[PDB]
């Protein structure tokens, strides 16, 4: 028989152009059959009725029932490319940062402000006009305020008085805009946040995309922290700039991939002060609109599957 690679995600991801491009290429492997789980099945059918697979590629995004995916993996015991239990942790920036620190990965100096919602004024925050103190730790402006939920993209940057004060409010992009200036200079007073030092870059973010620990594609985009105007090409796509990772950065990618147990893993680097700092780990993400990436990513994933499962199946492989 064929080795079955099962794809288990929300339809917005399963049916995305990058996913379809990569699955068509994985299907070219002679002994691999791809099965994409229907969203109606994922949401509405018990996991005992989900299709069988030998290798499971499954990842959380908004609205995905991760509990069911975990239960499926437990029931069927496939080879899992992206660890499902770790995807609970990736949803919490506190957990992400904890893992990065444990791996000796450079990240912005940060502090966690946990607020009890039934008692929002009893947390360890002191605010001045040009700084905050969080659990005693001082962050001079500029500083960054991130919701503890990694799925909440309402990240705020607070500007110093010397720069005219106010804040930059980021959000999941809406057409031409990724952020907007606000005259508000005071921090949010409900919710839990990470406060972190603002890392001075050249105005670009480096977005890194792993396919296993020994392959990483990187590209740069304009930082939303800049003015918030999205640069789009003639085709409506956000403008990307070329990046080659240095030796330190390839090691970061190796570490992130393995630490989060996410074969396919997106994360963000800030090139600042002669170093590279990780500020976000997103988990499963494909590069968009690169044919070379689609070719490479499919080859690596197919090869991983064959290396793992060819012997069980009595299939020749090197
Ligand atoms: O799951 P991913 O494929 O990683 O997609 C994540 C990002 O990708 P990346 O984080 O930049 O690599 C998408 O932005 P790009 O397509 O990269 O611009 C997002 O694409 P969008 O910003 O919609 C778009 F396609 F770029 P536009 O329609 O503005 O051209 C995608 O956001 P949506 O939710 O709105 O689809 C996001 O997913 P999520 O919001 O679930 O985090
Ligand atoms: N400490 C920091 N110093 C400077 N810029 C920062 C810092 N943290 C975040 N940023 C900027 O703010 C952007 C958004 O922060 P990030 O932590 O990636 O948020 P997110 O909501 O997880 N976005 P996404 O990549 O879509 O999941 C980054 O891409 C940087 O441009
Ligand atoms: Mg095939
Ligand atoms: Mg995601
Ligand atoms: Mg969108
Ligand atoms: Mg990010
Ligand atoms: Mg993120």
From Swiss-Prot:
- Its chief place of residence is cytoplasm
Keywords, alphabetical: ATP-binding, Cytoplasm, Deafness, Disease variant, Hearing, Kinase, Non-syndromic deafness, Nucleotide-binding, Phosphoprotein, Transferase
Q: What is the effect of changing residue 172 to A/K?
A: Reduces enzyme activity by about 99%
MF terms from GO for this chain are: 5-diphosphoinositol pentakisphosphate 1-kinase activity; ATP binding; diphosphoinositol pentakisphosphate kinase activity; inositol hexakisphosphate 1-kinase activity; inositol hexakisphosphate 5-kinase activity; inositol hexakisphosphate kinase activity; inositol-1,3,4,5,6-pentakisphosphate kinase activity
Which residues of this UniProt protein bind substrate?
Answer: 12-13, 172-173, 207, 221, 285-288
Q: Does the keyword Phosphoprotein apply?
A: yes
The listed locations are:
Cytoplasm, Cytosol
Q: Which residues bind ATP?
A: 93, 146, 153, 172, 196-199, 205-207, 223, 268, 280-282
Belongs to which family? Belongs to the histidine acid phosphatase family. VIP1 subfamily.
Job description of the protein: Bifunctional inositol kinase that acts in concert with the IP6K kinases IP6K1, IP6K2 and IP6K3 to synthesize the diphosphate group-containing inositol pyrophosphates diphosphoinositol pentakisphosphate, PP-InsP5, and bis-diphosphoinositol tetrakisphosphate, (PP)2-InsP4. PP-InsP5 and (PP)2-InsP4, also respectively called InsP7 and InsP8, regulate a variety of cellular processes, including apoptosis, vesicle trafficking, cytoskeletal dynamics, exocytosis, insulin signaling and neutrophil activation.
- Protein name in UniProt: Inositol hexakisphosphate and diphosphoinositol-pentakisphosphate kinase 2
Provide the species name.
Homo sapiens
* Gene giving rise to this polypeptide: PPIP5K2
Q: Which residues of the full protein are shown?
A: 42 to 359 of 1243
